[PDB]
Design a protein around this ligand. Structure first.
Ligand SMILES: CCCCCC/C=C\CCCCCCCCCC(=O)O[C@H](COC(=O)CCCCCCCCCCCCCCC)COP(=O)(O)OC[C@@H](O)CO
Ligand SMILES: CCCCCC/C=C\CCCCCCCCCC(=O)O[C@H](COC(=O)CCCCCCCCCCCCCCC)COP(=O)(O)OC[C@@H](O)CO
Ligand SMILES: CCCCCCCCCCCCCCCCCC(=O)O[C@@H](COC(=O)CCCCCCCCCCCCCCC)COP(=O)(O)OCCN
Ligand SMILES: CCCCCCCCCCCCCCCCCC(=O)O[C@@H](COC(=O)CCCCCCCCCCCCCCC)COP(=O)(O)OCCN
Ligand SMILES: CCCCCCCCCCCCCCCCCC(=O)O[C@@H](COC(=O)CCCCCCCCCCCCCCC)COP(=O)(O)OCCN
Ligand SMILES: CCCCCCCCCCCCCCCCCC(=O)O[C@@H](COC(=O)CCCCCCCCCCCCCCC)COP(=O)(O)OCCN
Ligand SMILES: CCCCCCCCCCCCCCCCCC(=O)O[C@@H](COC(=O)CCCCCCCCCCCCCCC)COP(=O)(O)OCCN
Ligand SMILES: CC(C)CCC[C@@H](C)[C@H]1CC[C@H]2[C@@H]3CC=C4C[C@@H](OC(=O)CCC(=O)O)CC[C@]4(C)[C@H]3CC[C@]12C
Ligand SMILES: CC(C)CCC[C@@H](C)[C@H]1CC[C@H]2[C@@H]3CC=C4C[C@@H](OC(=O)CCC(=O)O)CC[C@]4(C)[C@H]3CC[C@]12C
Ligand SMILES: CC(C)CCC[C@@H](C)[C@H]1CC[C@H]2[C@@H]3CC=C4C[C@@H](OC(=O)CCC(=O)O)CC[C@]4(C)[C@H]3CC[C@]12C
Ligand SMILES: CC(=O)N[C@@H]1[C@@H](O)[C@H](O)[C@@H](CO)O[C@H]1O
Ligand SMILES: *[C@@H]1O[C@H](CO)[C@@H](O)[C@H](O)[C@H]1NC(C)=O
Lengths: 144, 1256
């Protein structure tokens, strides 16, 4: 409960779902400042996602079960998991971090990608599984 | 040039010349240096042999001279180009634009028909005059809808941008995702939420090239947009933009009426014109041991066909497993090798038995040995799974021999090979020539990659032909060339599109139909060949009731009650939604209960009256009764159950979906709808055989795709990654903001997008991994909607060679395959109506009879004489110059609506005022007739009624405008101008005939439209219950939904036009992990239905587009020939009947319609023109006609129609126009008249009288 600005009491600024204990156990100036740099990069990417999502006027209609809140939550979770490929241990509720990917495409709207340098043919902007591949290992918190 | 080989070689060299000019391209030389010279090596040769060929003829040839001049010019240009003095990217290349036309010489000697070319000239005269008439009709409709759009819509430049945005700096990051239009008002159009503001993009220093071209700014842009929408290409999105920018009712009315009138009827008038062209062609062409015996065994044939089936199935069963499973010597390869050896032995044994001479004589065996040769080469490792695979997948054609019915149907519908073969050859040649012309026209324009090589130009022309995205090709080409040449380029593209869609695609339908009809020889010869409590129920069921009394007695009282109850239940079901269920909303159950209870009674009242089975008029006697009791049981079970929880993909949901078939009771309760269904299903056999042919084609091409495209369409969604190994991590993907705006990006600006995972996946809408995936992809391609995406994906991810695969199918499945449905439907329609076995002359005689029955005397009064006033003004009124001047004035007043009449705008004030003058002018016109012919006479014509109506409205508008002056007055004036413009159809003869055709087709099509609407309503209810809550996807958006019955109806109507229907289908197929499912209810989940969506959408599209939509075509093709007529040498012309009406009014001062039998001789003596009966040279015809009009009645005065029918009979060869019954009756009557006059002894008309008497 000491967001940096026992190492298991110091969480990151943006990726609040991670602790210095988890980072050092998986992935002090040396690595701490690198972790905060990764945090800043993830913050920038998530701010870009939020910029693209606020311009989606169909935010309160694309789904009867999902809202922009859960979409943003799961997307930030997935982004932080991709930036910190580590395993959490103090989580009370566990979830296979890869699952977060699915959650995104389950709770976020269908954003149409542009067709200039490639024809997607109805493919969404956010997809998880490829042509015949076993999607699912690390374990993260369930912040849903 | 006495040698015969020289002409063959010259044809070959003309083909080679077009081939060479098609290859003389800058990019082609850049990618292949040596070609740059080989081209120069060909022309220099050709240019000699051609030159030497003309001089040799000097010591249609003007064409040869001009073309050899063009060759010389092209060769000198290429000489200077190789010298680097003339840039290869210069417009000088256009010097070769005429060279492709040399291809005409290749197919010139084949213009030798079996008849004098005068017949061809006359046929083309007729067909071209009718084509010009229908083109003027289309222009009238286009101008009408253009002014309507300019007045009802404006410039769609109001978009929502982020709150704080100032002019000049509008960028990609300013618009919403996706870009949305809006309205500056507060209750009209779309209002975007907080954080965004509606602003005019054109005001923020944005060029129109960036915004687009389509719109309703002025008359020209509006007409362009209207013509684009008439092709049913990108009109729904225009409609969406309009609904966002302006009120909804405007867009709905406008666009739905445009699709109904322009995109359908007016476009079917061209098909009718081409069909009548073929009919006229037909008319003018008619006016003149141990192993030998076993081989022939039935078991061996069955065994060979079974082995062919097993072979095709095993070949198509090799689906994609994974990158870890496949080999070039797989088990499928060994099975194919075994089957190839088997069939090769099969062919060699046939040859050994029947000898190669007798074996090769058969066409089927020709094809079999060709397949043998092609497959024995395909089993070679280097050729396995290559373009040779075609041969293998053609083996299935052999199976066509198992069903003799399908074989004979193929032989029939494809008719003599020559017709459709020549049509295909002409299509290919014209495509090649137009592609070459467009190439040499745009091969040099920079930043335009659509005509940089001949393959791309051919692809562009083919795309324009298929109408899928042709507007995009045109827009790209226009943006490429400067705004100075943009108008001429647009005119060229529009002319090509017109000729390709309204002539060629119509020629295909015409050829298929003509082949589906018998020829006049066999038609003629075939027509020659065939010369208690039960009493109360009975009373209550069988009790029933001008034409109002006929309508009230159309059905029984009980059937009327059932019709009203069904309509009420349907109106109630229209209010059901995924969130307002009939199970939880009592107000919606009322109707339900009614429909059940009432229906029950009805059933019983009928059962107890007619039993159920084994009676003449039972209740469950037809399929209609079975459907009725099925609907009843479904409704009763649902009412008694009323499940409060309906899980998705459950039995309760299936019950709910089946409950949507209630509107089909109107098909059984209304006699006319029963007639529609019966007449449609009478051709189900031919429909089924055409479906089997299309399924065979799709199976062939799906097998090919699966063996050659399996797993090869997957790619990394990151365009920067190439290999599957590096397709991991994340990357910044760009989101699609707008595909209508061409807003360029700045050097210091980033496109809107966000970070996503890198994945190696196929397209969501199609793939060729299994046989089912490939079959569904090709079924979607068959609709020509989104097929350019498949083309591009196959050309990019697999290879450019395979661009052939997608282009042949689209030609055999769409230009020919789907045409078969049109032909079959129209032929079954004509057969049901009873005009299929009649020769063309008999059809024309029937049409003339109808036209003369609907004709009435020209009731215009005579020219006064007592008063110089009225006489002078009457002479001035009925002068053709005055009529055409008033027509030109009516046409010019409509030009005042070229700009939107607006109170915010000053340009309106002059225009309106100008129109006022026009109005006054028109008054005078009307007024002068009210003085020329007197109110009694002026009110005689029903056209003058409309004239006076609109003129009175215009006067009222002038008063209210120069008295109040407001927006409502301007709208009234615009409506008045539109009405007076619509009045123009009464000034033109052929325009009047064509609008009569269209309106009478709309009238006679009423019940077919009603049945289509009933099917659409059943499908709409089913869709609201199936996909009512489906997560928004590619095309399921704020506009396209199934949340309401109206939303479903509108999206289904859009689907009827095919506008991205497969995208909606794939959107409704969404399943986890792309949606959150629910185990309880179906209205609490954002998931779709895979198989449900497939069934729904595929069946709807098939039934509506491929079958019922053609029913309208037929009707048009009918009423067209019923109303449109041209001057002929065998029947009565429009000129003839107008002259007859004139002379009738001249000889009959009275207007009782009857003429004394002694005044009939006066009428005949007075009849001049093409109907003159000369008494100095033709006294016999005159005497016969007089005696006929005197005998028709025992001295009673005859009728206008009586004399008209006499002249009709006396103006055509009865033996070639009448049928057995009427021909015999008429010949008997005429010979009776003749011999009676003989005993009493003690020009078209004249020419046919000579025919008759001389033949006697
Ligand atoms: C004239 C023709 C008009 C056609 C009008 C509508 C046609 C509709 C076409 C789409 C039909 C799709 C049917 C989907 C309905 C559904 O989804 O139901 C399924 C069909 C059946 O599911 P079940 O096997 O019983 O469930 C299994 C168990 O869990 C419960 O029993
Ligand atoms: C008529 C003759 C048409 C020409 C046939 C040539 C056959 C050889 C094809 C291989 C050409 C290689 C081109 C390589 C290339 O890179 O060009 C490609 C485009 O051309 C391509 O694919 C080629 C796409 C093929 C288009 C022509 C397919 C012919 C099929 C005819 C069937 C319909 C006939 C209708 C009338 C009977 C790339 O396109 P993009 O720039 O990405 O857009
Ligand atoms: C002639 C008519 C029959 C032609 C032969 C059809 C043979 C189909 C069976 C072989 C086959 O294609 O198997 C695939 C099944 O293909 C079919 O769908 C058959 C459907 C027939 C229509 C396997 O599918 P999958 O395991 O890859 O999973 C599918 C993922 N969407
Ligand atoms: C609009 C004008 C309708 C014109 C109808 C018409 O032509 O008259 C029909 C008389 O009207 C009717 O019979 C129709 C009566 C009402 C039936 C339609 C009910 C539609 C219910 C829709 C339910 C919506 C939910 C008789 O047609 P026919 O087939 O006998 O002519 C044969 C030509 N040779
Ligand atoms: C599924 C379609 C089955 C069609 C069965 C045969 C259709 C038929 O002939 O309907 C008869 C019965 O009329 C009906 O009740 C039609 C009921 C069918 C309504 C559903 C039709 C769907 C609309 C067309 C679908 C096209 C599918 C492709 C009309 O003949 P009729 O005038 O002689 O009837 C009186 C017999 N004495
Ligand atoms: C037959 C086949 C073709 C049929 C096509 C339908 C033809 C109907 C033509 C009716 C006349 C249309 C005249 C359009 C017009 O008057 O323009 C006004 C269109 O306005 C309206 O749509 C409402 C009034 C419609 C005309 C009244 C209906 C006439 C029915 C009789 C402009 O209004 P505004 O733009 O100034 O409105 C505020 C702008 N911010
Ligand atoms: C020609 C008409 C259209 C032909 C299209 C043929 C390709 C479509 C079949 C694709 C097969 C592979 C997809 C598949 O899995 O098939 C599912 C559905 O395949 C079908 O049979 C639906 C096809 C309906 C086409 C109706 C077209 C009607 C055209 C005539 C009007 C089977 O469902 P399921 O085994 O997963 O169990 C479902 C549990 N509720
Ligand atoms: C059916 C008969 C009567 C006429 C059919 C026309 C073809 C036989 C000829 C005419 C034009 C020729 C084409 C002219 C241009 C090209 C492009 C040329 O060079 C490229 O494709 C470079 C483009 C690139 O790959 O970037 C390859 C040959 C090709 C396809 C030629 C293939 C053979 C074509 C289609
Ligand atoms: C007949 C003419 C009016 C019909 C009635 C119209 C209304 C209803 C109420 C209906 O009861 C409900 O609708 C329960 C839900 C509710 O409305 O509270 C039962 C059928 C019934 C009696 C119908 C039965 C058949 C009737 C009596
Ligand atoms: C063809 C005519 C003469 C008789 C029509 C009888 C139908 C009313 C039967 C045949 C199929 C039956 C359906 C088959 C499946 C189910 C799923 C069932 O729910 C579950 O089984 C779960 C609810 C009844 C229902 C709709 C049945 C309703 C009654 C149906 C439509
Ligand atoms: C709902 C919303 O975003 N409203 C904005 C507000 O936040 C902003 O401060 C203002 C410009 O000063 O424009 C408006
Ligand atoms: C997005 O657009 C930019 C142009 O600003 C381009 O460089 C980039 O490659 C695009 N991204 C993708 C994934 O195509």
């Amino acid at each position: 409960c000491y967001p940096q600005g026992n190492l298991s009491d110091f969480y990151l600024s943006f990726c609040n779902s991670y602790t210095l204990w988890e980072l050092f156990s998986g992935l002090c100036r040396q690595c701490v400042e690198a972790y905060q740099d990764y945090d800043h990069h993830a913050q920038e990417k998530y701010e870009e996602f939020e910029s693209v999502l606020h311009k989606y006027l169909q935010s309160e209609e694309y789904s009867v079960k999902s809202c922009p809140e859960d979409c943003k939550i799961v997307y930030k979770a997935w982004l932080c998991s991709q930036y910190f490929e580590v395993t959490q241990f103090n989580c009370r509720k566990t979830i296979p971090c890869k699952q977060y990917c699915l959650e995104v495409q389950t709770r976020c709207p269908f954003i149409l990608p542009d067709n200039d340098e490639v024809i997607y043919g109805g493919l969404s902007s956010f997809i998880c599984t490829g042509l015949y591949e076993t999607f699912l290992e690390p374990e993260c918190c369930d912040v849903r | 040039i006495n040698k015969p080989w020289v002409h063959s070689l010259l044809r070959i060299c003309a083909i080679i010349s077009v081939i060479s000019v098609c290859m003389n391209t800058p990019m082609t030389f850049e990618h292949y240096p040596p070609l740059q010279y080989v081209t120069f090596t060909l022309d220099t040769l050709l240019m000699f042999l051609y030159t030497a060929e003309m001089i040799a003829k000097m010591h249609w040839c003007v064409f040869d001279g001009f073309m050899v001049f063009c060759l010389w010019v092209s060769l000198v240009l290429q000489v200077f180009e190789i010298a680097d003095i003339v840039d290869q990217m210069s417009p000088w290349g256009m010097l070769r634009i005429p060279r492709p036309l040399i291809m005409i010489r290749a197919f010139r000697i084949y213009f030798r028909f079996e008849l004098p070319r005068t017949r061809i000239t006359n046929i083309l005269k007729r067909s071209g005059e009718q084509i010009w008439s229908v083109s003027i009709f289309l222009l009238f409709f286009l101008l009408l809808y253009g002014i309507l759009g300019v007045q009802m819509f404006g410039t769609f430049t109001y978009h929502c941008v982020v709150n704080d945005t100032k002019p000049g700096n509008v960028t990609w990051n300013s618009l919403a995702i996706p870009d949305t239009h809006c309205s500056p008002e507060l209750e009209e159009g779309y209002q975007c939420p907080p954080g965004f503001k509606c602003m005019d993009l054109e005001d923020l220093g944005l060029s129109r090239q960036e915004l687009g071209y389509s719109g309703f700014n002025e008359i020209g842009t509006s007409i362009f947009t209207v013509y684009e929408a008439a092709s049913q290409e990108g009109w729904v999105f225009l409609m969406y933009r309009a609904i966002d920018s302006f009120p909804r009712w405007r867009s709905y009315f406008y666009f739905i009426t445009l699709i109904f009138f322009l995109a359908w009827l007016v476009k079917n008038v061209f098909i009718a014109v081409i069909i009548e062209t073929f009919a006229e062609i037909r008319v003018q062409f008619q006016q003149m041991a141990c192993l030998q015996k076993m081989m022939r065994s039935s078991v061996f044939h069955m065994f060979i066909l079974s082995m062919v089936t097993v072979d095709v199935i095993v070949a198509a069963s090799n689906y994609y497993k994974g990158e870890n499973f496949r080999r070039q010597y797989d088990e499928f390869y060994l099975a194919e090798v075994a089957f190839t050896v088997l069939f090769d032995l099969e062919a060699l044994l046939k040859i050994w038995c029947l000898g190669f001479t007798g074996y090769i004589s058969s066409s089927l065996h020709k094809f079999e040995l060709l397949l043998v040769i092609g497959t024995t080469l395909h089993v070679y490792p280097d050729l396995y799974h290559s373009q040779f695979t075609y041969f293998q997948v053609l083996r299935v054609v052999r199976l066509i021999k198992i069903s003799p019915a399908l074989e004979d149907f193929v032989y029939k519908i494809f008719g003599p090979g020559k017709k459709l073969g020549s049509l295909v050859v002409f299509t290919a040649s014209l495509l090649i020539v137009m592609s070459a012309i467009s190439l040499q026209m745009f091969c040099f324009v920079e930043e335009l990659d659509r005509f940089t090589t001949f393959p791309r130009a051919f692809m562009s022309m083919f795309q324009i032909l298929t109408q899928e995205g042709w507007v995009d090709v045109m827009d790209q080409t226009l943006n490429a060339v400067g705004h100075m040449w943009a108008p001429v380029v647009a005119i060229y593209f529009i002319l090509y599109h017109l000729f390709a869609t309204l002539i060629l695609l119509s020629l295909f339908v015409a050829v298929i139909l003509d082949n589906l009809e018998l020829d006049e020889d066999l038609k003629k010869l075939k027509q020659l060949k065939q010369s208690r409590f039960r009493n109360f129920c009975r009373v209550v069921v069988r009790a029933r009731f001008h034409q109002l009394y006929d309508l009230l007695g159309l059905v029984t009282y009980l059937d009327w009650v059932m019709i009203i109850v069904t309509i009420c239940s349907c109106i109630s079901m229209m209010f059901e939604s995924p969130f307002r269920r009939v199970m939880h909303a009592p107000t919606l159950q009322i109707a339900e209960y009614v429909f059940v209870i009432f229906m029950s009674i009805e059933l019983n009242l009928k059962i107890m009256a007619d039993g159920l089975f084994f009676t003449p008029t039972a209740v469950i006697r037809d399929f209609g009764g079975v459907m009725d009791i099925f609907i009843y049981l479904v409704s009763l079970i649902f009412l008694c159950w009323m499940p409060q929880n309906v899980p998705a993909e459950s039995g309760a949901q299936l019950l709910m979906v089946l409950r949507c078939l209630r509107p089909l009771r109107i098909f059984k309760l209304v006699p006319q709808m029963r007639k529609v269904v019966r007449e449609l299903f009478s051709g189900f056999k031919e429909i089924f055989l055409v479906s089997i042919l299309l399924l065979t084609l799709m199976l062939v091409f799906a097998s090919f795709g699966v063996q050659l495209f399996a797993g090869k369409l997957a790619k990394c969604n990151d365009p920067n990654i190439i290999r599957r190994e590096d397709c991991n991590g994340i990357f910044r993907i760009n989101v699609s903001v707008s595909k209508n705006l061409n807003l360029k990006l700045r050097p210091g600006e980033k496109k809107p997008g966000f970070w996503v995972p890198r994945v190696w996946a196929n397209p969501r809408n199609f793939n060729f991994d299994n046989v089912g995936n490939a079959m569904l992809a090709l079924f979607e391609v068959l609709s020509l909607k989104g097929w350019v995406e498949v083309r591009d994906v196959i050309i990019h991810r697999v290879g450019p060679i395979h661009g052939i695969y997608i282009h042949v199918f689209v030609f055999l499945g769409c230009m020919i395959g789907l045409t078969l449905f049109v032909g079959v439907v129209i032929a079954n329609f004509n057969e049901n109506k009873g005009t299929a076995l009649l020769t063309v002359d008999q059809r024309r005689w029937e049409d003339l009879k109808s036209r003369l029955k609907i004709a009435q005397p020209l009731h215009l009064p005579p020219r006064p004489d007592n008063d110089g006033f009225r006489a002078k003004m009457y002479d001035i009124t009925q002068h053709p110059f005055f009529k055409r001047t008033i027509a030109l004035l009516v046409l010019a007043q409509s030009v005042l609506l070229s700009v939107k009449w607006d109170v915010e705008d000053p340009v309106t004030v002059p225009l309106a005022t100008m129109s006022v003058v026009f109005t006054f002018i028109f008054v005078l016109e009307v007024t002068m007739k009210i003085i020329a012919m007197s109110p009694a006479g002026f009110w005689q014509s029903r056209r003058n009624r409309y004239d006076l109506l609109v003129t009175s409205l215009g006067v009222v508008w002038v008063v209210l405008h120069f008295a109040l002056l407001n927006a409502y007055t301007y709208m009234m004036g615009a409506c008045v101008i539109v009405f007076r413009f619509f009045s123009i159809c009464g000034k033109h003869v052929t325009l009047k005939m064509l609008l009569l055709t269209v309106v009478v087709s709309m009238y006679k099509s009423f019940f077919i439209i009603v049945g289509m609407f009933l099917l659409l309503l059943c499908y709409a209810f089913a869709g609201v219950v199936l996909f009512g809550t489906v997560k928004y996807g590619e095309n399921i958006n704020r506009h396209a939904n199934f949340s309401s019955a109206g939303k479903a109806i509108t999206v289904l109507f859009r689907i009827v036009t095919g506008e991205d229907w497969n995208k909606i289908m794939h959107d409704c197929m969404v399943q986890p992990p792309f949606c959150t499912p629910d185990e309880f209810t179906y209205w609490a989940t954002d998931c779709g239905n895979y198989a449900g969506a497939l069934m729904y959408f595929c069946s709807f599209y098939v039934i509506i587009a491929y079958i019922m939509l053609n029913l309208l075509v037929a009707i048009i093709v009918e009423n067209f020939s019923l109303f449109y007529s041209t001057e002929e040498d065998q029947l009565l012309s429009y000129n003839d009947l107008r002259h007859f009406q004139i002379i009738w009014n001249m000889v009959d001062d009275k207007r009782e319609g009857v003429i004394p039998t002694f005044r009939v001789k006066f009428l005949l003596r007075l009849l001049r023109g093409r109907l003159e009966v000369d008494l100095d040279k033709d006294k016999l015809l005159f005497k016969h006609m007089c005696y006929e009009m005197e005998r028709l009645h025992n001295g009673g005065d005859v009728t206008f129609h009586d004399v008209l029918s006499m002249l009709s009979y006396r103006s055509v060869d009865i033996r070639k126009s009448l049928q057995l019954e009427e021909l015999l009756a008429r010949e008997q009557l005429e010979y009776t008249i003749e011999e009676e006059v003989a005993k009493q002894t003690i020009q078209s008309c004249s020419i046919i009288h000579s025919l008759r008497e001389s033949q006697q």
